[PDB]
Specification:
Cytoplasmic side (chains A, B): 1-306
Number of helices of chain A: 8
Order of helices and strands of chain A: HEEEHEEEEEEEEEEHHHHHH
CATH architecture of the domain at 201-300 in chain A: Orthogonal Bundle
Protein name (chains A, B): 3C-like proteinase nsp5
Strand order of the largest sheet of chain A: 5-4-1-2-3-7-6
Helix content of chain A: 10-25%
Subcellular location (chains A, B): Host cytoplasm; Host Golgi apparatus; Host nucleus
Largest sheet of chain A: 7 strands, antiparallel
Cross-link (Glycyl lysine isopeptide (Lys-Gly) (interchain with G-Cter in ubiquitin)) (chains A, B): 5, 90
Oligomer: homodimer
Shape of chain A: elongated
Structural class of chain A: alpha+beta
Subunit structure (chains A, B): 3CL-PRO exists as monomer and homodimer. Only the homodimer shows catalytic activity. Interacts with host FBXO22; this interaction promotes the proteasomal degradation of nsp5.
Bound molecules: the ligand *C(=N)[C@H](C[C@@H]1CCNC1=O)NC(=O)[C@@H]1[C@@H]2[C@H](CN1C(=O)[C@@H](NC(=O)NC(C)(C)C)C(C)(C)C)C2(C)C
CATH superfamily of the domain at 201-300 in chain A: main proteinase (3clpro) structure, domain 3
Chain lengths: 306, 306
Amino acid sequence: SGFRKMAFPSGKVEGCMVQVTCGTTTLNGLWLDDVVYCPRHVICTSEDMLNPNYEDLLIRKSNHNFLVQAGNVQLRVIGHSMQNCVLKLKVDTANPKTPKYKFVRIQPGQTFSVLACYNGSPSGVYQCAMRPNFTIKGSFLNGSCGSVGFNIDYDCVSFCYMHHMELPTGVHAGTDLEGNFYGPFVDRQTAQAAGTDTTITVNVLAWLYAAVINGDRWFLNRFTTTLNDFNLVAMKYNYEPLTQDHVDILGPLSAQTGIAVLDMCASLKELLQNGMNGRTILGSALLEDEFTPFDVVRQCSGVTFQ
Amino acid sequence: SGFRKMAFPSGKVEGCMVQVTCGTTTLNGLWLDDVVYCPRHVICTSEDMLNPNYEDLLIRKSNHNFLVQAGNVQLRVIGHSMQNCVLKLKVDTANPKTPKYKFVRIQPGQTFSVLACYNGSPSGVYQCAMRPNFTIKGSFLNGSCGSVGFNIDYDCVSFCYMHHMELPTGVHAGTDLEGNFYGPFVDRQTAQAAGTDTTITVNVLAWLYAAVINGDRWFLNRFTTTLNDFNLVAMKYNYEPLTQDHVDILGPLSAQTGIAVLDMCASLKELLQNGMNGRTILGSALLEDEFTPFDVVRQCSGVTFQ
Ligand SMILES: *C(=N)[C@H](C[C@@H]1CCNC1=O)NC(=O)[C@@H]1[C@@H]2[C@H](CN1C(=O)[C@@H](NC(=O)NC(C)(C)C)C(C)(C)C)C2(C)C
Ligand SMILES: *C(=N)[C@H](C[C@@H]1CCNC1=O)NC(=O)[C@@H]1[C@@H]2[C@H](CN1C(=O)[C@@H](NC(=O)NC(C)(C)C)C(C)(C)C)C2(C)C
């Protein structure tokens, strides 16, 4: 029993993290086979950041301007190129610890683990969701750029996020591993702001199922509702609309608990309208939306990885 | 900026986890140098658990009754002994991935990361605190026994917890790595219950400092209080008493924010008496007590490990 915000084990990623220095700027890189991936803004000076011309800035660099350190070993850079917003440094040594991996671009609502790093060294791991406005609510300080987000599927590391910047509201923005930003952000210091965020409805329902599995049943009721009546209520409260795909995704949890999806929606509708009135669910006094249906199954069924 | 429940990177522990089978029971073991540590209840059958005589049960076993698997490799057990509630299996191979480590018995209020495992394989990592009643609020399913809790200090893994059992309230109990239970629990299926829990005051104050560091200041006020007036209020609300040692521990955070400890206690006193009135702190609508002062410093200053 029990329910925690659980991250994937980080060991397979820790062995891929390196330190990248260009000029006075040091951040983190991801070393897979013989390529080191890192944010291209590592090539900017203070002068450059209001409106950098990255093609100009890169043509003025040579391989020896990039210092790559894996622990104490220095890696020799033998080529460099830019793909969208990531720099790719070809090095003379293939990482012997390269895991089986793929690069994936995730959608809003999906969750992943972040390995936060400074100077090429892991500081800590935590779980977070891609918000509907394409930011993440992370925890990052100076020097953290290049830290990556990932999932594990059996034996395969799926990299989905590389950290680039913090927005003035204290939330975070970055790219997939092919260098494309999530959201409408750009890697220059121009005024930018996150859109308004919404609550990820399908995840809130998954977490209410987890609560039932763990014995928290006080919010259940005998009613039911329809998708259209539910979605009309949800939109008043800044909740994402529920689709039939979402209903089907929640199938395994509905079956395990014997509570139909649209029954659970009727409970959520009540919680939105009347509130929780100083009661808690799974130790929280707010409705939680950073667990996916798969996260719940994984943690309430005990899935492992190799 | 940002503040998350952050676990230590798990890589150094993942390489120490193995599978231990005795009879029909399989759980996890910890493989350090040439010794595998695991809960001694692995030697019990269903018949044995109401009142096992572990000395009898162990004398009836031989080395070949214990199957130890590290991935696909089988490890040959060459000796066995019992220390308190842990079994120590001597094996013929020293783990080449043994990190620098020590064994530490922690006190209530301290936090650590748990690497939850099934069949010798890591499922996920999460952070939790040793509660004042010597339980942890973990997330564990069948087969999870032998999963360990740990901290990292520079280059050294400090193991502090091995999982043994779940109590009827859904919380968890286990031992240090020398086999001594935390709390008044025993490894037999007799009626046992956790004492009443209290809230870890020094951690709540640390988390309020984190909130200030991250810009959440609405709960601050101009008042101040004394330790004795504070402790009189705190005891009414099931909060642990505050000591002068606690005040000194909070020194670095007081200095960084310019808010004196006893000033912050006056804010907490107000929060206890009037409540939060539907406002949140660091995204929570409850006062959080599973971050230590060191956890806050580490995460708001960016400490790493090697
Ligand atoms: C990467 N190492 C840091 C990560 C920052 C440090 C504090 N927390 C974080 O997430 N990222 C950067 O240095 C990026 C990079 C230049 C500035 N910047 C920022 O994150 C700034 N934000 C910023 O300028 N935001 C707007 C929306 C563009 C105004 C900063 C340092 C947090 C003020 C560039 C964007 C190229
Ligand atoms: C270890 N693999 C499991 C971990 C359990 C499984 C569900 N979640 C957990 O934390 N632990 C055990 O099998 C221990 C072990 C025998 C039973 N037991 C329990 O955890 C039971 N609890 C129990 O009997 N509790 C009281 C307080 C003693 C009544 C169970 C399976 C959760 C009912 C022994 C204690 C030797």
